Amino acid sequence: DQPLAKDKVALLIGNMNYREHPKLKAPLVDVYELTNLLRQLDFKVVSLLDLTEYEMRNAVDEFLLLLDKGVYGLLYYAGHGYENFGNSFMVPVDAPNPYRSENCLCVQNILKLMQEKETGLNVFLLDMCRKRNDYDDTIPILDKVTANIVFGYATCQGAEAFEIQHSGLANGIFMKFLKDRLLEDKKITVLKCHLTKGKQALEIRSSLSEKRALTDPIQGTEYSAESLVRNLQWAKAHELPESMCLKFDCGVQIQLGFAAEFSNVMIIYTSIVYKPPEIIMCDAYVTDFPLDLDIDPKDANKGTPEETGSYLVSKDLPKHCLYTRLSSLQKLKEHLVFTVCLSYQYSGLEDTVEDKQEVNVGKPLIAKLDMHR
Ligand SMILES: C[C@@]1(C(F)(F)F)CN(C(=O)Nc2cnc(-n3nccn3)c(Cl)c2)c2cnc3cc(Cl)nn3c21
Ligand SMILES: [Ca+2]
Ligand SMILES: [Ca+2]
Ligand SMILES: [Ca+2]
Ligand SMILES: [Ca+2]
Ligand SMILES: [Ca+2]
Ligand SMILES: [Ca+2]
Ligand SMILES: [Ca+2]
């Protein structure tokens, strides 16, 4: 018969800003573009950048809690990894140098937890940068039947070769794999990666009792409290604050708008939307962000979103603003309180008047979970 999904859930993790290890760049683009693909296939997606051990374990555990009988679950990791005695590990951004298994999340344990579910399809995809000389070890096989599983594991030896092979947009190995191997053609309307130098590997392994695809329909409910819970739990972790018109005392109106780039990355943007006739010149800027978010002012207040480090290009956002990228939202302890400043001059005068308003926007996106240490 036709295979159906009970639900479609996905978790995508991209680690880049490593403290004790060389920084990567590729994950950002590949997480974003895979998120966009899966979203069009009717997955609810969580997409997280730059996670610590604690954050990664909470994220993966709560993903595994969503896997139940019939559920289609996809997990993706990109960033540094390591291998020891058949066991592979995903390295968080706070990991010490050298790597230790206590600090890292083990791949095989996640694989064993996923196959202990009666899911309709498990997909686990790893796009690891390895250390240069970290090849696969000599092992016995000591310790994949009824579970439907697709396991994909890509490696490049060294950050150089990793970033080289991942150069380009749209060209992710697993995005290509999913589009070619896991999508049935006419069921959906969806909107070269040359082999580069160095040492690389790809392994793909599958065990399926019947044909399964990411395009398989969700078994739809009209009156399920479980469907409601599932949808609402995800959706309330993805609320943006509404656009604000900030009216200053002198009559200047600044509009403040918001965009989601990841579940833990929000773009904010400002524009003047009314200047009164008394005032000849004005400008506005944002400052005073919570220290937990770690905002560098040099990546704030920029006149294109591209300059903040965003994926979002000048076509994707309202034009003619100053843009600021607020990453690390999972670290927010209290409320995202910040300050919008206005500088203005009265008609004909050299005198610049400064003014400011404090904005509270609550706990946007994944910050709503309030799950910090
Ligand atoms: C239910 C959630 C939610 F995000 F939608 F609410 C919960 N969850 C999390 O990732 N949760 C999470 C918890 N704590 C932390 N954290 N931040 C600081 C300290 N601990 C972080 Cl980063 C993440 C996942 C993961 N994958 C999926 C896929 C779908 Cl669908 N939902 N989903 C979820
Ligand atoms: Ca649809
Ligand atoms: Ca530990
Ligand atoms: Ca090894
Ligand atoms: Ca790429
Ligand atoms: Ca019915
Ligand atoms: Ca708190
Ligand atoms: Ca003055």
Swiss-Prot record:
Belongs to the peptidase C14B family. A motif (Nuclear export signal) lies at residues 34-41. The active site is at H80, C129. Keywords: Acetylation, Chromosomal rearrangement, Cytoplasm, Disease variant, Disulfide bond, Hydrolase, Immunity, Immunoglobulin domain, Nucleus, Phosphoprotein, Protease, Repeat, Ubl conjugation pathway. It is linked to Immunodeficiency 12: A primary immunodeficiency characterized by onset in infancy of recurrent bacterial and candidal infections resulting in bronchiectasis and growth delay. Manifestations include mastoiditis, aphthous ulcers, cheilitis, gingivitis, esophagitis, gastritis, duodenitis, and meningitis. Levels of absolute lymphocytes and serum immunoglobulins are normal, but specific antibody titers are low despite immunization, and T-cells show impaired proliferative responses to mitogens. A chromosomal aberration involving MALT1 is recurrent in low-grade mucosa-associated lymphoid tissue (MALT lymphoma). Translocation t(11;18)(q21;q21) with BIRC2. This translocation is found in approximately 50% of cytogenetically abnormal low-grade MALT lymphoma. Highly expressed in peripheral blood mononuclear cells. Detected at lower levels in bone marrow, thymus and lymph node, and at very low levels in colon and lung. The chain holds residues 336 to 719 of 824 of the full protein. GO terms for biological process: B cell activation; B-1 B cell differentiation; defense response; innate immune response; lipopolysaccharide-mediated signaling pathway; negative regulation of apoptotic process; nuclear export; positive regulation of canonical NF-kappaB signal transduction. It comes from the Eukaryota. Residues 13-216 are annotated as: Caspase-like. This is Mucosa-associated lymphoid tissue lymphoma translocation protein 1. Protease that enhances BCL10-induced activation: acts via formation of CBM complexes that channel adaptive and innate immune signaling downstream of CARD domain-containing proteins (CARD9, CARD11 and CARD14) to activate NF-kappa-B and MAP kinase p38 pathways which stimulate expression of genes encoding pro-inflammatory cytokines and chemokines. Mediates BCL10 cleavage: MALT1-dependent BCL10 cleavage plays an important role in T-cell antigen receptor-induced integrin adhesion. Involved in the induction of T helper 17 cells (Th17) differentiation. It comes from Homo sapiens (Human). The keyword Zinc does not apply. Coiled coil: none annotated. GO terms for cellular component: CBM complex; cytoplasm; cytosol; fibrillar center; nucleus; perinuclear region of cytoplasm; polkadots; protein-containing complex. GO terms for molecular function: cysteine-type endopeptidase activity; endopeptidase activator activity; endopeptidase activity; identical protein binding; peptidase activity; protease binding; small molecule binding; ubiquitin-protein transferase activity. The keyword Transmembrane does not apply. It is found in: Cytoplasm, Perinuclear region; Nucleus. Homooligomer; forms oligomers which bind to TRAF6. Forms a complex with CARD14 and MALT1; resulting in the formation of a CBM (CARD14-BCL10-MALT1) complex. Forms a complex with CARD11 and MALT1; resulting in the formation of a CBM (CARD11-BCL10-MALT1) complex. Forms a complex with CARD9 and MALT1; resulting in the formation of a CBM (CARD9-BCL10-MALT1) complex.
